[PDB]
Design a protein around this nucleic acid. Structure first.
Ligand SMILES: [Mg+2]
Ligand SMILES: [Mg+2]
Ligand code: NA
Ligand code: NA
Lengths: 243, 237
DNA sequence: AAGATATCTT
DNA sequence: CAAGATATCT
């Protein structure tokens, strides 16, 4: 399938290549910093060619947002199925120690999931799947990373990360019940070990429950204290008649 | 000086090199995306070696934040004058012409000396902005080292400048939910030449220290530099 | 103007 | 954790 082929390709590319710097047309290389903004960008760039190759092998068109602030990073679709689009977002996080529990931010809960068209490339209802390509790595302190390098010194450039793992999973499957950010109102994933993401050991029973939960999640602890603040309280609120 | 040598080295580096991709240790190259998240990251990384090299020449230690959401990107100080630190932030924007930059939070360390800042605010004696401006070009394959000149670049004509944060600061928020200081909205020449609107750094700090978060609240205080000067006249109320 | 894009810190 | 930081755009 497109999906199994994609994760096999991402998994393989991750095992075979180690990004180590940004290169200029003239051949000069500038090392990577260890901060999350840097690594997030690099893994998104790393993923692009792979997503395109696999999509193309399957007859899917790949479209990226024309505008900044628009979800998703990649919209895939066969010309013949414009209402079965696939959204692919890229999410990254780090670990201080290998194999510790992790959590991702999974996008806003107050735009297109509530407003079918706010900040989304195509109206929400034209997508049948929303996949997260998750990357997790153990951070490594940055020294030798403060100078430039030449192509003949590639293997020598220090990398600010060490044990990158990648997964491809449905957004609803790994979504948790606690926000992943405050002022930027993000859906938070489960807080769990990497294996749980791969396995899909989430908290929602269905994609409809996930959607309903995030569609009605209040923005502040104050308000959630009176409605629901976790999945158990949500199920109680549902039981009661959404009140 | 440290400052003139830094601006000269940034100008020169930018003229000589065109970043065009991310490379792996195995030699495979991945092209750049065209959005700001990508470009701001690349210009920041591009600037790191230049900054360190010039700081070393002048005898300054260079320190980056351990926590990613802490200002500034680079803290410079001579070990003999720890209390005279220099902060350098990198800010980027694009053009298709007047431009504007986001210049950092106005509700953290400028208000409470220690919030989200590497060293207490009072230990810094200068705040420099390295500004990159580029024209957006309006590939999904991988390349090898022999194809460097073949990789499409997502930008056209980058310009870089170094200026004091207060000099290029404006009076309108550069962001909403993330409460950023906005720079002046002007021509690139204006940032180079320092044609701002604040009469002093004291005014700039006081203006952003007292700027309300939303329009409604600002309407009862001040929404621009003129209203702020009137607020000062009223006795800061 | 206010709120999107990613994800971290305490 | 909840809230607000990091950058910058629409
Ligand atoms: Mg995304
Ligand atoms: Mg910065
Ligand atoms: Na995310
Ligand atoms: Na900025």
């Amino acid at each position: 399938s497109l999906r199994s082929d994609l994760i096999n390709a991402l998994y393989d590319e991750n095992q075979k290549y180690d990004v180590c710097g940004i290169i200029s047309a003239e051949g000069k290389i500038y090392p990577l910093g260890s901060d999350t903004k840097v690594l997030s960008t690099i893994f998104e760039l790393f993923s692009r060619p792979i997503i395109n190759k696999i999509a193309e092998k399957h007859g899917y068109i790949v479209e990226e947002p024309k505008q900044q602030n628009h979800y998703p990073d990649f919209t895939l679709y066969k010309p013949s199925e414009p209402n079965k689009k696939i959204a692919i977002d890229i999410a990254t996080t780090y670990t201080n120690k290998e194999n510790e529990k992790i959590k991702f931010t999974l996008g806003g809960y107050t735009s297109f999931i509530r407003n079918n068209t706010k900040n989304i490339v195509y109206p929400f209802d034209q997508y049948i799947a929303h996949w997260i390509i998750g990357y997790v790595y153990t951070r490594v302190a940055t020294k030798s990373s403060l100078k430039t390098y030449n192509i003949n010194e590639l293997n020598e450039i220090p990398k600010p990360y060490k044990g990158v793992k990648v997964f491809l999973q449905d957004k609803w499957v790994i979504a948790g019940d606690l926000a992943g950010s405050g002022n930027t109102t993000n859906i938070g994933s489960i807080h769990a070990h990497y294996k749980d993401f791969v396995e899909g050991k989430g908290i929602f029973d269905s994609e409809d429950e996930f959607l309903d939960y995030w569609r009605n999640y209040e923005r502040t602890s104050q308000l959630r204290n009176d409605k629901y603040n976790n999945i158990s309280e949500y199920r109680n609120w549902i039981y009661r008649g959404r009140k």
